[PDB]
Structure 1
Amino acid sequence: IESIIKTATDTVKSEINAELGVVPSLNAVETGASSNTEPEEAIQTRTVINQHGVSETLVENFLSRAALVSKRSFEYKNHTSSEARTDKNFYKWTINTKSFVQLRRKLELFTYLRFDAEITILTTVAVGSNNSTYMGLPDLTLQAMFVPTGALTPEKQDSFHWQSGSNASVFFKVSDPPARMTIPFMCINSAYSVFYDGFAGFEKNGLYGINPADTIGNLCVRIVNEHQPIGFTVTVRVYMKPKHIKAWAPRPPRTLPYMSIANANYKGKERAPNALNAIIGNRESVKTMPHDIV
């Protein structure tokens, strides 16, 4: 407790400490992690002043890396002519922390996470394969509107829900710096429960793990410009940088590959490593050293 240490702690000089009645290396794992330090036993250490880095491995600095949370490549054409389910020059994305396994595993080291989401939207335009000719990349103004969870989301590109009188929207060009915005810590609880051992509704048919409090919202991203005669694959990549991190109850890292966004269902690879019956790639025996120096 009350440690405001800014570097790695230095070790002191250790002599021969063969004292009867006390032994530091003998501990109890059945209490917690052991307190046997380096100059206490098992090594006759020297006094080395430790000036090593700690600010980089801060939980803030651990989780303040802008990693991808929504890579959606939607076509930009006459979608109103003949499309059924595909994204009609717009997509409503439920803002989840779980779409990409890197930042999902990074935030899933902790049970609770209070952070503001620095959402940076990097949108790229490519020409779709139907046109098969470049003809220039157009400067496209895009609207990303943060709709609250469960509120009324637009259904069209010109759906008249894009006025953003009360909803917060950001207009940004593709020939511009990427859209940097800060979604607040908007959870109704005092942290985002990255895991939820419970159900959303008071009925028994609710979904497991989907607390709507920790659901951030819905980024509805559209092209503000009307349709071009040429279709364009607009690949919008929302990277979320979690900032002002306050973390609680650290957890085992996710070892098996993720299967679903909604839950923590597990199925390992068909052989080790990261398999269901064997997280680590198997050695020949207990007495066999892999990558032994020869």
Structure 2
Amino acid sequence: SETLVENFLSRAALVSKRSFEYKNHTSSEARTDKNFYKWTINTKSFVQLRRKLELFTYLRFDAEITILTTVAVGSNNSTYMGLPDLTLQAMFVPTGALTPEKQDSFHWQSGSNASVFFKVSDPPARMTIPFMCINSAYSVFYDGFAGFEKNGLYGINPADTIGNLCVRIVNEHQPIGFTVTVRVYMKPKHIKAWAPRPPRTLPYMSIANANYK
């Protein structure tokens, strides 16, 4: 029973820990986070849960998402001052839907998209991402190309891109900067696993492909 695949794959492993900075990034920033981070939901960024999910080909599951956000003071301020409250509008962007580019990026209203509301002074955000892919399971691999052009990337599904889990500061900027470490936890429930693969032996170098060295 403990060795059931539902019991096996439902471990809340950290797959994206983004310590994204909360400051007036509109003042002088070039490429970095503008009080928001756009993370495409792929379960392959951290190799523990990745090698847990390279065990199988096809993995249809209801992907429970748990977002634990901890606000720490910035090193520029170098003062504690107490932890201020900060509600976060955590949007999931589905495949095909547009992704935001700013903190006030006009997509955060989410007329079609689904966003949740929570605070930092509240236990972590537990919702359940629906199994949304066009195919009947999550092909974590793709022996093929996403597009019909030759330069399409190998290994990427045009259907298993889960979305973009975009988390911002809906509140305005503070004069005191704060590094918000957002930790993303995947609890895949309702595991429907198919066709087991060997566990990976050689270390990874690229998240997208399965190259070896």
Shorter-chain TM-score above 0.5: yes
Q: Distance in 2 between matches of 1:261 and 1:228?
A: 35
Deviations 1:211-255 (A, max 9, x none): 121111111110111100000000101101111000001010011
Instruction: Tell me what 1:211 maps to.
Output: 157
Matches within 5 A, 1:214-253: 214-253=160-199
Deviations 1:250-272 (A, max 9, x none): 01001111111111111xxxxxx
Q: Distance in 1 between matches of 2:131 and 2:144?
A: 21
Which runs of no fewer than 5 residues in structure 1 stay unpaired?
A: 1-54, 267-294
Q: Distance in 2 between matches of 1:143 and 1:213?
A: 25
Q: Where does structure 1 differ by over 6 angstroms across 4 or more consecutive aligned residues?
A: none
- RMSD between aligned residues: 0.8
Aligned-pair CA distance for 1:70: 1.2
Say which one has the larger Rg.
1
Q: Distance in 2 between matches of 1:123 and 1:231?
A: 15
Q: Distance in 1 between matches of 2:175 and 2:96?
A: 35
Q: Distance in 1 between matches of 2:89 and 2:209?
A: 30
SS at structure 1 position matched to 2:8: helix
Q: Distance in 1 between matches of 2:82 and 2:49?
A: 34
Deviations 1:155-205 (A, max 9, x none): 111111101221000111111010001111111001000111111001111
SS at structure 1 position matched to 2:19: strand
SS at structure 2 position matched to 1:98: coil
Aligned-pair CA distance for 1:149: 2.4
Deviations 1:108-127 (A, max 9, x none): 10011000110000001111
Instruction: Tell me what 2:84 maps to.
Output: 138
Which runs of no fewer than 5 residues in structure 2 stay unpaired?
A: none
Aligned-pair CA distance for 1:56: 0.5
Aligned-pair CA distance for 1:151: 2.4
Q: Distance in 1 between matches of 2:73 and 2:12?
A: 27
Aligned-pair CA distance for 1:143: 1.1
SS at structure 2 position matched to 1:122: strand
Say which structure, 1 or 2, has more relative contact order (CA 8 Å, 6+ apart): 2
Is the strand fraction higher in 1 or 2? 2
Q: Distance in 1 between matches of 2:112 and 2:190?
A: 26
What TM-score, normalized by structure 1, do the two folds share?
A: 0.71
Instruction: Tell me what 1:201 maps to.
Output: 147
Deviations 1:84-105 (A, max 9, x none): 0000000111110101111111
SS at structure 2 position matched to 1:61: helix
What TM-score, normalized by structure 2, do the two folds share?
A: 0.97
Aligned residues: 212
Q: Distance in 2 between matches of 1:214 and 1:103?
A: 17
Deviations 1:44-89 (A, max 9, x none): xxxxxxxxxxx10001100011111211111100100000000000
